[PDB]
Structure 1
Amino acid sequence: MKGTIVGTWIKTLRDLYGNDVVDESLKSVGWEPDRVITPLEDIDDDEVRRIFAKVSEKTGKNVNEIWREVGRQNIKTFSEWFPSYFAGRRLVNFLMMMDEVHLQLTKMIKGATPPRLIAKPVAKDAIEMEYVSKRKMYDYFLGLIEGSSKFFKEEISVEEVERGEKDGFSRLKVRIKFKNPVFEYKKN
């Protein structure tokens, strides 16, 4: 997992559960609370799993519940650490921009396997976003969408269209409907 993104999760975990829980979890994997992750660093996915596992044991919360809360609260962290991706944009533009963003930030990473997040208009007031990844982080995905709604102050409804797993890849397709139209028909 791209290092600087893991850095945001650590900060978000501190907001949710405290410096003690987090410091203890990082210590269990040999980290240093004051460690500064660089833009070119890649953090082993298994290390992230162990960190979250420790948070789970310390807080007594299910790992999936933690990922959901981290997704919900991480949008705020992103807004502070990567302000340029926000800056006055509207929720729909933000969401449709994510697929390209993930490809960009993992361009020069060791093996590079970013989640695909293709979004496409399906109505004047809705889009279909499909999560595709070997990691199956459905809860984080759904939480980030909820948090995006809260951050941008734009009410939405999220309906699961379908989910599946094939050849190692997990897929989750949701239909996001906005309260007000965000698209108009234009000649193709």
Structure 2
Amino acid sequence: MKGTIVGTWIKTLRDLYGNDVVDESLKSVGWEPDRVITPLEDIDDDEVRRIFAKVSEKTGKNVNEIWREVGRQNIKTLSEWFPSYFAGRRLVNFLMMMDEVHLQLTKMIKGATPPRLIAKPVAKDAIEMEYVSKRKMYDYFLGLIEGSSKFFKEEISVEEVERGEKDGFSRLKVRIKFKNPVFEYKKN
């Protein structure tokens, strides 16, 4: 996992659960309690997993539920740290831009396995967005979507269409419906 995003998660964990839980979780995998993780680093996925399991044990919340809560709150953290990804956008543009963003942020790592987040319109007021990744981070993905809605103040209805592993990759497809129409038919 690129350090760019792991750094945001550590802050978000502090925001949600507090410094003791976070400091102890970091110390439990051999990190300095105050470690600041940089874009220059590649963090092992299994370490992130151990940290979250320790956060789980101390809070007494299921780890899926923690990823869900982190997903929702991390949008806030992202918009404070990298506002230019948010400014002058509405929800629909932000979400459709996300696949491209994750390729751009990992393209100079080789062996990079960004999550794929391809979205397409399926109706005047709806898109289908599909999470595809080896990392099975389904609750994070869903949480991020819920936090994006809340950050842009745009109500959405989200339907999980399908979730499972297709040939090695975890996949989760959702249909996201906006309150009003956001697309219109145009000459292709």
Check whether TM > 0.5: yes
- Higher alpha-carbon deviation: 158-167 or 15-24: 158-167
Partner Cα distance (2:29, 2:56) in 1: 15
- Higher alpha-carbon deviation: 166-175 or 71-80: 166-175
Partner Cα distance (1:125, 1:113) in 2: 31
Deviation at 1:163, TM superposition (A): 1.9
Which consecutive unaligned segments of at least 5 residues does structure 1 have?
none
User: Does the 8 Å CA contact 1:129/1:175 hold for their aligned counterparts?
Assistant: yes
Deviation at 1:117, TM superposition (A): 0.2
Deviation at 1:108, TM superposition (A): 1.7
Count of aligned residue pairs for this structure pair: 188
Partner Cα distance (2:33, 2:152) in 1: 31
Deviation at 1:109, TM superposition (A): 2.1
| CA deviation string 1:12-54 (max 9, x = no partner) | 0001100000000001111123322222211000000000010
Partner secondary structure for residue 147 of structure 2: helix
Partner Cα distance (1:4, 1:76) in 2: 15
Partner secondary structure for residue 34 of structure 2: coil
Partner Cα distance (1:76, 1:164) in 2: 29
Partner Cα distance (1:19, 1:30) in 2: 16
TM-score by length of 2: 0.97
TM-score by length of 1: 0.97
User: Does the 8 Å CA contact 2:24/2:33 hold for their aligned counterparts?
Assistant: no
Partner Cα distance (1:163, 1:107) in 2: 27
Partner secondary structure for residue 68 of structure 2: helix
User: Does the 8 Å CA contact 2:158/2:177 hold for their aligned counterparts?
Assistant: yes
Partner Cα distance (2:57, 2:162) in 1: 32
- Higher alpha-carbon deviation: 101-110 or 91-100: 101-110
- Counting aligned pairs with the same residue, the percent is 99
User: Does the 8 Å CA contact 1:40/1:109 hold for their aligned counterparts?
Assistant: no
RMSD: 0.9
User: Does the 8 Å CA contact 1:26/1:51 hold for their aligned counterparts?
Assistant: yes
Partner secondary structure for residue 159 of structure 1: strand
- Higher alpha-carbon deviation: 160-169 or 74-83: 160-169
Partner secondary structure for residue 170 of structure 1: strand
- Higher alpha-carbon deviation: 94-103 or 35-44: 35-44
Partner secondary structure for residue 170 of structure 2: strand
User: Does the 8 Å CA contact 2:23/2:34 hold for their aligned counterparts?
Assistant: no
| CA deviation string 1:89-111 (max 9, x = no partner) | 00000000000000011112252
Deviation at 1:167, TM superposition (A): 2.5
Deviation at 1:58, TM superposition (A): 0.6
Partner Cα distance (1:101, 1:140) in 2: 17
User: Does the 8 Å CA contact 1:129/1:176 hold for their aligned counterparts?
Assistant: yes
Partner Cα distance (1:33, 1:182) in 2: 45
Partner secondary structure for residue 171 of structure 1: strand
1:116-135 alignment to 2 at 5 Å?
116-135=116-135
| CA deviation string 1:59-116 (max 9, x = no partner) | 1110000000000100000001111100120000000000000001111225210100
